[PDB]
Ligand binder design. Structure first.
Ligand SMILES: Nc1ncnc2c1ncn2[C@@H]1O[C@H](COP(=O)(O)OP(=O)(O)OP(=O)(O)O)[C@@H](O)[C@H]1O
Ligand SMILES: Nc1ncnc2c1ncn2[C@@H]1O[C@H](COP(=O)(O)OP(=O)(O)OP(=O)(O)O)[C@@H](O)[C@H]1O
Ligand SMILES: Nc1ncnc2c1ncn2[C@@H]1O[C@H](COP(=O)(O)OP(=O)(O)OP(=O)(O)O)[C@@H](O)[C@H]1O
Ligand SMILES: [Mg+2]
Ligand SMILES: [Mg+2]
Ligand SMILES: [Mg+2]
Lengths: 249, 391, 72, 236, 51, 384, 244
């Protein structure tokens, strides 16, 4: 608390660091997020999220963090989801606009980049365009998608306004324990089911509850079937087949 | 009421009275020290007594005059004195205390200089046997220290073969709970050099310039000492950055901050004074007590790795009775990146759960509960993100 | 003090023409041990002897201070 | 005025949302439990004050559509704003899209409503939390949702908010069953009355119950009805 | 006078003291003197505007 | 009642101790034995007539020392040295000889009026279970405060270091104050108690010396428990801002880190801190291993208050009228100091009557005065 | 600049709360006692002036009582200056409703509208609230006689008997003890005068310090007669009750 800071009276002010403090703060709100793991292969992209129950009275199969942008682009939100509520609407609009103007699928990168333009509008009124935010968003996205010009892409969208193309990425609280494992286990010879079970693997270790289909959710983007959210039954099957190969060691 | 209360009132007051009376009549005793292995001391104790040979008015040299001396006594009273026949003339130095005859002032026995320090004899410390293996890990940051501080005390040969100037100073900094001071207690075990330990808030006195005396004299006493180390602990107060206030009360503190600079560089080098500064914070420090030539190598002390926590926890659980077949790896994974001071407390709180189940042993079950216990309180508390930016 | 507080004291002292004593705190001040208290006792003693009298202490700013250390 | 009333906090939060949550903790307590064919919202009213007109004063449960109820905890004054916006949206849906709202859509709208006064400048969040319950039209699934001043929305099997909600929540883990609701309406009602008597205590006049059955049937049970139900629970 | 206590008026002064000189090291000793000379009535007058 | 006989029995043991003690001192303490006579003789032969109190600055290991007397002049004194060459240390009060000043002897002990505030003569007339209720968050304060003093044997089976430290935190009036004073009656080891508003001073430099002291005394007696009541008081209390302020508060905290654990390796100082401003403390204070099990206290629940209220009304007169259960109904998660102020104010209603019966009416009436306090610094009425 | 000096008075406290509302409520307990008692036959609004001088004119004074419409009047307690604005806004809303439905406004609608207006100032804008409390006396056919109180937050509650301003709690206890479920307007007048007699800050309660108005079902077949009394009629009913 009350960490020493010389500037919290502006929202765009320096900072003997040389960078914005509020942006820095924003990236420290993704460390409380519920873990979202995402494995990108050349055969599809798999997005797994822990749905995060907080009560057994809470119905957790009516809440989810998998949010469809369009048939060929899916997205996972981690951090503060009330902010994502706004951003995801904007992105859906953008995609539909592109298909209106061009009768064409939007690039995964172009979309990610549009939402980064959205992220950077915090201010009191400055540059040529009106600031309609006052404080930056505190929510990060894993935008997965497939386009016919670069194949499968997985992008990490920051509340900074910066985007990095990843081949696998984890965000949330357990993101470091997951990324250590990503660095070692990932390669470019994976297949779809191998990556799927890899997600359930690394989701196990960042599991703070227990792994089953009632606090864990999978979804895929595939080329010829589009974006598909795995129902809970199928997820259960995969979890049990993980437990089979876990007792083969 | 009940038919005893009328006399319970009196009987009870009698208890209060008689305890006072027993103690008063018994009397007390307050020792006036003696020794049982002594029962005769006055066969020539009277030669130290009664027939003076003599106790002496302590003085101080203010002026050597070349071929008598001027002393001003502590009774402030100035006199002119010379040389008896237990004095040597080569042995009078400015500001040295001397003994002179209580009757006709003449030097009998010179005496160590400077009676103004008396609270620096309580910051001289024997080396606690926290052992040198006690420190966690076999990590490499403590091996850097063994190059700067420890080895030139053991062997200035290799530094003479190199011909370099051997590095003397080093900064200890990083998060607390990493055992900042715990590795310096280990290094106090190994090197067996004098350790003189300073508290930064102990350097602040009621009136200003009083702590200027303190610091200056402390240093020169260490110059006389040979093969010594001065461990600057917790000098975040006095030791901080210099700046102006124009009406502050920080100025009076900053005086002794300056006093720390002027002795380190000096107009003479540090003759085998190895210097440690221990700071919680690099976020504010002086730039001339953090200049790189007088703190030479500065070692960042880090958080244990996923291996490093396994090493620390093995030092800790090898010290505990646990029933074999356990993983010290597993417990590190369950924890986030964290301190070993938590690991020192995962054992002890798991031991309170061990006594609760009334085990003589500790098992896996009670370790799990403990890991949850500490993490949850950490979140409830500061410094789960506090570093006060910079690297 | 520019208001003429003392001016008024001189003025009515010259008018009433009763005995008057000119003391100050630098005439009570310590210079050796036990000096100061003695100076205090004397001035009232004289006043009563040739009573009635006026005792004037020009300033008591130093002598009295709202705050004290008393650690020295 | 365009200056922020929302400053980002280095903690990973915004102070005002925390303060809002506190405000919502000081508010009166609401319980929501859905049966198999009903929804039951029970609410504490402080009628401890005397010579209060209660006929003309609106209950703490507001009908927002013919089949969608909203109950609230937190700042009483503030809530009325949300209530007006929501009734308006309800009519808009029929106007442009035709077919009364669904519980989820309306819930989503309210979520965006409270969210907006966070992210905007010149405004502070609402310190109000709502229980939105009801039925979808052409449907008979009770849907019970909870929205909170974070601008985050939730589905629940059963939920409670307000003062000392934790006690009743623990009760609910142990007296309501995720698998089985109490199937008769009356038993559901009495389960919630038995819940309310934990904290509400001090007679059966501070208890208010609204029961909703599909086909647009919102009815609020008067004090007499409650007296009977309570006394049954008391005897047992 | 009627309770037969020593009426100890405290007023924030330290002139009364010449042997400790602060009230952060004279709370106990104040209480203790009223114990010696018991009973007493400790009139801690806090005006709550001083300074 | 009916304890008259045992109090007479205790008294009777006291009569016998006073008697035999007195006669033993009187005349049969026979100093006609030579191991009494001859030891004092030649002890007084070197020992004074005036004994010239001095202050030992430092010692020299040639059977000499430099004393500075409070009268003035220093002296380079000898030492008769039947007093054990190495038993005296800087800060001692030494007896100098009225002739040539030699250290005749050494006084063992001396004390300050500033450590009088610290130390205590008390023996509480309350023992535990006048803290009856909240009886499982009090196993965290008698398993890490009481027990390792009572049994180190249990912590030897497990081995490794035993517990150290607690921080008590929660709402005010939930018993924090009496918890500390209740373990001190059980343990019977040196109980120091120091308020945090005396650790805040209007003079600097003496702040740190006070804080450094507490634990140096505390380690010096082998067992001690130091109650720092109200370490929430270090950021909300401050005098002037030119000798108080940020600076004063920062230093004292810094001192406490060295003292509390640091590098001193001082004696046993089990620490108890009461606080409800725990986020005005350092992260090296609330660091683990100085707090080992930390205790959270929240307001009791309805059935816990029944435990609290029955403790308080046992001391009072009762009737069949009195009903405790409906006093509980009215209160809803309030402190036990509120409950305790109802029973205290209930006898104030009996005092007002000058009628020594306590009735259900007296408890209900003071209930309303107690609830008048909560909601009439409030002026909303109903939550706006 | 301007963010520098911004005080931020519409933010929460750590309580979840608004100091400005609390402070306004505090300042209204510095203002006069206003009382509303609902009889089964009418409503009595009785207000005590804050100022009184033998040089003050109290004969054109309606500083506390205002007609919002010829069915609904209010008793005002707090800052007069802020209250004036709300009063004319209220009248404008009343006439608007009358304009578009051609039928007199219920008491419900008006009380709530004003509450919303107050709510807007606390909700956003950086402004201070309007520090007024209203007691509304009204008659409508749907619920009959209606008595309401609303506060600077923008919250309303209906009551059977209520007091606002100075000594809220005292007058409330009094009204508890002396209330009947049905009363007459005469009985109600008597109770009102008495309550103000035991809460008045001057030893005596006088007609020249009383503002007194009623709305009465004297007028028959669904007509109500408002009355804002003359001080000389207040005098007479003050001698009726035997205060003077
Ligand atoms: N590296 C380590 N290996 C083993 N034990 C450790 C280590 N670091 C700390 N400890 C344990 O934790 C205890 C306390 O830590 P220590 O007091 O040395 O912290 P510190 O680094 O001096 O922090 P600060 O000075 O800021 O309070 C030690 O006595 C020891 O038991
Ligand atoms: N009312 C006046 N008529 C004429 N002269 C005056 C008047 N008031 C003040 N003065 C002059 O101003 C000067 C100061 O007055 P005075 O000698 O009374 O000292 P003072 O105010 O007490 O100063 P301090 O006490 O600091 O020494 C004198 O020279 C005095 O004659
Ligand atoms: N849980 C409890 N069990 C038994 N007695 C209690 C309990 N809580 C409070 N009491 C009684 O209430 C008392 C008043 O408590 P005390 O003054 O010690 O409270 P506190 O919590 O320390 O207050 P503060 O919040 O001011 O620090 C105690 O002296 C005690 O006898
Ligand atoms: Mg340290
Ligand atoms: Mg003058
Ligand atoms: Mg206390």
């Amino acid at each position: 608390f009350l960490t020493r800071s010389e500037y919290d009276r502006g929202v765009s002010t320096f900072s003997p660091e040389g960078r914005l403090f509020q942006v820095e703060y924003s990236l420290e709100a993704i460390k409380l997020g519920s873990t979202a793991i995402g494995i990108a292969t050349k055969e599809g992209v798999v997005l797994g999220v822990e749905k995060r129950a907080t009560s057994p009275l809470l119905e957790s199969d009516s809440i989810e963090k998998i949010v469809e942008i369009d048939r060929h682009i899916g997205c996972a939100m981690s951090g503060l989801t009330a902010d994502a509520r706004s951003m995801i609407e904007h992105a859906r609009t953008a995609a539909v606009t592109h298909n209106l103007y061009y009768d064409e699928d939007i690039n995964v990168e172009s979309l990610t980049q549009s939402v980064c333009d959205l992220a950077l509008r915090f201010g009191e009124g400055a540059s040529g365009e009106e600031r309609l935010m006052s404080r930056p968003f505190g929510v990060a996205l894993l935008i997965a998608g497939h386009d016919a010009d670069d194949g499968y892409q997985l992008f990490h969208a920051e509340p900074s306004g910066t985007f990095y193309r990843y081949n696998a990425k984890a965000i949330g609280s357990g993101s470091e324990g997951a990324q250590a494992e990503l660095l070692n286990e990932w390669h470019s010879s994976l297949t779809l089911k191998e990556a799927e079970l890899l997600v359930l693997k690394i989701l196990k270790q960042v599991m703070e509850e227990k792994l089953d289909e009632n606090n864990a959710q999978l979804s895929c983007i595939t080329k010829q079937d589009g974006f598909k959210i795995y129902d809970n039954e199928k997820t259960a099957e995969l979890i049990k087949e993980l437990k089979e190969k876990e007792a083969a060691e | 009421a009940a038919p005893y209360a009328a006399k319970l009132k009196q009987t009870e007051n009698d208890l209060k009275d008689i305890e006072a009376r027993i103690k008063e009549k018994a009397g007390v005793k307050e020792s006036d020290t003696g020794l049982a292995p002594s029962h005769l001391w006055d066969i020539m104790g009277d030669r130290q007594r009664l027939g003076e040979e003599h106790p002496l008015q302590v003085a101080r040299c203010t002026k050597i005059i070349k071929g008598k001396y001027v002393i001003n006594l502590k009774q402030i009273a100035k006199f002119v004195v010379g040389l008896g026949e237990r004095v040597r003339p080569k042995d009078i130095e400015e500001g040295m205390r001397v003994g002179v005859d209580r009757s006709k002032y003449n030097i009998e026995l010179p005496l160590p200089p400077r009676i103004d320090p008396s609270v620096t004899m309580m910051t001289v410390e024997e080396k606690p046997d926290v052992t040198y293996s006690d420190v966690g890990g076999c990590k490499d940051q403590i091996e850097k220290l063994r190059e700067v501080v420890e080895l030139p005390l053991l062997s200035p040969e290799r530094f003479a073969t190199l011909g370099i100037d051997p590095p003397k100073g080093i900064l200890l900094y990083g998060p607390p709970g990493t055992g900042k001071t715990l590795c310096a207690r280990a290094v106090a075990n190994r090197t067996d050099a004098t350790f003189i330990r300073v508290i930064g808030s102990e350097l602040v006195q009621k009136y200003v310039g009083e702590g200027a005396r303190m610091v200056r004299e402390l240093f020169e006493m260490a110059r006389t000492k040979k093969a010594c180390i001065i461990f600057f602990d917790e000098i975040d107060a006095v030791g901080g950055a210099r700046f102006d206030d124009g009406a502050g009360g920080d100025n009076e503190v900053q005086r002794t901050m300056l006093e720390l600079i002027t002795q380190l560089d000096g107009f003479d080098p540090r003759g085998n004074i190895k210097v440690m500064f221990a700071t919680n914070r690099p976020n504010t420090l002086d730039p001339a007590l953090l200049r790189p030539g007088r703190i030479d190598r500065k070692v960042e002390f880090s958080l244990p790795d996923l291996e490093g926590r396994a090493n620390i926890f093995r030092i800790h659980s090898k010290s505990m009775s646990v029933e074999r077949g356990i993983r010290w790896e597993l417990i590190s994974r369950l924890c986030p990146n964290s301190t070993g001071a938590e690991l020192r407390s995962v054992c002890t709180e798991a031991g309170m759960f061990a006594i609760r189940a009334r085990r003589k042993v500790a098992t896996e079950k009670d370790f799990l509960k403990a890991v949850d216990k500490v993490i949850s309180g950490y979140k409830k508390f500061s410094s789960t993100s506090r570093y006060m930016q910079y690297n | 003090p520019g208001t003429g507080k003392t001016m008024l004291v001189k003025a009515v002292a010259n008018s009433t023409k009763a005995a008057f004593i000119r003391v100050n705190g630098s005439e009570f001040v310590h210079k050796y041990l036990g000096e100061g208290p003695r100076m205090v006792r004397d001035v009232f003693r004289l006043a009563r002897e040739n009573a009635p009298s006026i005792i004037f202490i020009d300033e008591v700013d130093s002598i009295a201070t709202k705050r004290f250390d008393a650690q020295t | 005025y365009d200056r922020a009333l929302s400053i980002f906090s280095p903690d990973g939060h915004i102070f005002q949302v925390e303060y809002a949550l506190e405000a919502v903790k000081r508010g009166t307590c609401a319980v929501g439990v859905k049966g198999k064919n009903c929804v039951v919202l029970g609410c504490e009213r402080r009628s401890t004050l005397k010579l209060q007109d209660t006929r003309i004063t609106p209950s703490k449960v507001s009908k927002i559509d013919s089949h969608v109820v909203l109950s609230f905890s937190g700042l009483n004054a503030d809530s009325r704003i949300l209530i007006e916006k929501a009734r308006v949206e309800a009519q808009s849906h029929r106007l442009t899209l035709e077919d009364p709202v669904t519980v989820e859509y309306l819930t989503r709208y309210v979520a965006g409503v409270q969210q907006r006064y966070t992210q905007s400048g010149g405004v502070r969040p609402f310190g109000v939390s709502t229980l939105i319950a009801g039925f979808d039209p052409r449907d008979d699934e009770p849907k019970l949702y909870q929205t909170e001043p974070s601008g985050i929305y939730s589905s629940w099997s059963a939920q409670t908010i307000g003062r000392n909600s934790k006690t009743v929540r623990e009760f609910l883990e142990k007296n309501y069953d995720r698998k089985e609701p109490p199937a008769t309406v009356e038993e559901c009602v009495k389960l919630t009355v038995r819940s309310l008597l934990e904290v509400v205590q001090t007679g059966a006049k501070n208890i208010e119950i609204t029961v909703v059955k599909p086909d647009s049937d919102i009815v609020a049970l008067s004090s007499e009805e409650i007296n009977q139900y309570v006394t049954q629970i008391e005897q047992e | 006078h009627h309770t037969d206590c020593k009426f100890i008026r405290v007023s924030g002064a330290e002139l009364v003291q010449k042997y400790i000189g602060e009230g952060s090291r004279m709370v106990r000793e104040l209480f203790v003197m009223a114990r010696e000379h018991a009973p007493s009535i400790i009139f801690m007058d806090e005006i709550d505007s001083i300074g | 009642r009916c304890k008259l006989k045992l109090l007479r029995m205790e008294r009777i043991k006291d009569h016998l101790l006073l008697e035999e003690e007195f006669v033993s001192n009187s005349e049969i303490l026979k100093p006609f034995e030579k191991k009494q006579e001859e030891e004092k003789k030649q002890l007084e032969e070197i020992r004074g007539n005036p004994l010239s109190i001095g202050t030992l600055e430092e010692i020299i290991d040639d059977d000499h020392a430099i004393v500075t007397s409070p009268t003035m002049p220093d002296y380079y004194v000898s030492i008769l040295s039947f007093v054990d060459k190495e038993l005296l240390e800087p800060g001692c009060s030494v007896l100098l000889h009225h002739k040539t000043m030699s250290i005749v002897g050494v006084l063992q002990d001396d004390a300050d009026p500033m450590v009088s505030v610290m130390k205590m003569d008390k023996s509480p007339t309350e023992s535990y279970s006048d803290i009856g209720g909240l009886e499982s968050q009090i196993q965290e304060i008698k398993e890490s405060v009481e027990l390792p003093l009572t049994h180190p044997e249990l912590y030897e089976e497990m081995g490794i270091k035993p517990p150290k430290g607690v921080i008590l935190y929660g709402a005010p009036g939930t018993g924090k104050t009496l918890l500390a004073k209740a373990v001190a009656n059980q343990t019977s080891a040196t109980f120091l108690r120091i308020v945090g508003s005396e650790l805040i001073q209007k003079y600097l430099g003496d702040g740190p010396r006070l804080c450094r002291q507490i634990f140096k005394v505390a380690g010096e007696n082998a067992p001690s428990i130091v109650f720092i009541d109200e370490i929430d008081a270090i950021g909300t209390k401050r005098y002037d801002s030119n000798s108080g302020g940020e600076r004063e508060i920062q230093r004292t905290m810094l001192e406490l880190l060295n003292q509390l654990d640091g590098f001193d390796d001082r004696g046993d100082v089990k620490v108890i801190m009461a606080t409800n401003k725990i986020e005005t403390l350092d992260p090296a204070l609330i660091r683990p291993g100085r707090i080992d099990r930390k205790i959270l206290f929240e307001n009791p629940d309805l059935s816990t208050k029944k435990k609290i209220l029955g403790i308080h009304t046992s001391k009072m007169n009762l009737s069949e009228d009195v009903n405790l259960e409906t006093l509980v109904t009215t209160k809803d998660d309030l402190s036990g100091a509120d409950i305790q102020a109802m029973c205290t104010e209930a006898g104030l209603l009996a005092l007002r009557e000058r009628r020594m019966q306590v009735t259900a009416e007296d408890f209900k009436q003071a209930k309303e005065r107690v609830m008048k306090n909560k909601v009439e610094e409030n002026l909303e009425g109903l939550y706006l | 600049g301007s963010r520098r000096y911004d005080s931020r008075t519409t933010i929460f406290s750590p309580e979840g709360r608004l100091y400005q509302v609390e402070y306004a409520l505090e300042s209204i307990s510095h203002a006069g006692t206003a009382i509303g008692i609902m009889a089964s036959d009418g409503i009595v609004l009785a207000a005590e002036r804050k100022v009184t001088s033998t040089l003050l004119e109290q004969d054109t004074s309606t500083e506390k009582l205002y007609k919002l419409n010829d069915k609904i009047a209010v008793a005002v307690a707090g800052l007069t200056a802020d209250a004036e604005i709300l009063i004319n806004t209220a009248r404008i809303h009343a006439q608007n409703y009358l304009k578009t439905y051609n039928e007199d406004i219920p008491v419900e609608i008006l009380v709530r509208r004003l509450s919303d207006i107050k709510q807007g100032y606390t909700q956003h804008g950086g402004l201070r609230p309007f520090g007024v409390s209203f007691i509304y006396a009204g008659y409508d056919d749907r619920y009959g006689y209606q008595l309401y109180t609303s506060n600077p937050s923008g919250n309303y509650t209906g009551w059977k008997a209520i007091s606002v301003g100075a000594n809220t709690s005292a007058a409330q206890t009094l009204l508890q003890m002396d209330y009947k479920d049905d009363m007459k307007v005469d009985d109600a007048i008597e109770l009102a005068l008495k309550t103000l007699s035991k809460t008045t800050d001057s030893s005596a309660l006088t007609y020249d310090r009383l503002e007194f108005a009623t709305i009465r079902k004297g007028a028959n077949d669904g007509e109500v007669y408002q009355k804002i009394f003359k001080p000389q009629e207040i005098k007479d009913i003050l001698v009726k009750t035997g205060i003077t």
